């Protein structure tokens, strides 16, 4: 691979430079190369990996939605181009899922990393589900559900209810229920109990931890108030 001759630390340094330059494809490629060195990622490095691919797939998703809307309102050209963007999106999701399964998801590991990566697996199956149809969609939806559910089980056992990673997982799993799995009742229940259980434990947190937790709680509330 093109990154195999580069030092791990240099890849991480260049991922940070790519982020400053808003070159997210480069950022993701550098972080992929770093993952392929076979060492665990630190917390900061996990966040770099996530930001990089979020921005890549985010641009593809936004373009796919634009093209799909034009297609629904409507020669073969719109479909062809939507299919091209769709295939590139699926390729990125397959890359991320491959990194997770081949390098990053382990039975060992601290709760913080295990939940982070299982949530990520749920997220990238969710992005595949957004563009899937029919029975293929059903299988993809179950893959996302299974990953989120395993992350949820770990988070409830091993993390406090204010932990920001636990909160972001609940946020995204509730979005999955609402937007993908046709389960708005479950989405609403999950968001509400998550918010309420975090609220009750805020008194244990420092000023800094309070801001980290409450920012994600505010996002849960925004979705709850949108949905109800």
């Amino acid at each position: 691979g093109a990154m195999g001759s580069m030092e791990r630390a240099s890849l991480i340094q260049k991922a940070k430079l790519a982020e400053q330059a808003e070159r997210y494809e480069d950022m993701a490629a550098f972080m992929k190369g770093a993952v392929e060195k076979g060492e665990e990622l630190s917390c900061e490095e996990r966040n770099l990996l996530s930001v990089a691919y979020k921005n890549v797939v985010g641009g593809q998703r936004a373009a796919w939605r634009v093209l799909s809307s034009i297609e629904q309102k409507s020669g073969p050209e719109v479909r062809e181009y939507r299919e091209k963007v769709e295939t590139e999106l699926q390729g990125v999701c397959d890359t991320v899922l491959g990194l997770l399964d081949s390098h990053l998801i382990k039975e060992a590991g601290d709760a913080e990393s295990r939940v982070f990566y299982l949530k990520m697996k749920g997220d990238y199956y969710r992005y595949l589900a957004e563009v899937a149809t029919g029975d293929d969609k059903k299988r993809i939806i179950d893959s996302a559900r299974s990953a989120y559910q395993e992350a949820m089980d770990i988070s409830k056992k091993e993390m406090p209810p204010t932990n920001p990673i636990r909160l972001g997982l609940a946020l995204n799993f509730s979005v999955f229920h609402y937007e993908i799995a046709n389960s708005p009742e479950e989405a609403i229940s999950l968001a509400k109990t998550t918010f309420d259980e975090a609220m009750a434990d805020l008194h244990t947190l420092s000023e800094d931890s309070y801001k980290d937790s409450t920012l994600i709680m505010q996002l849960l509330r925004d979705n709850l108030t949108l949905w109800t």
Binding site: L171, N172, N223
Partner: peptide, 7 residues
């Protein structure tokens, strides 16, 4: 769509 975690 409902928004997911922005990060």
């Amino acid at each position: 769509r409902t928004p997911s975690l922005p990060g």
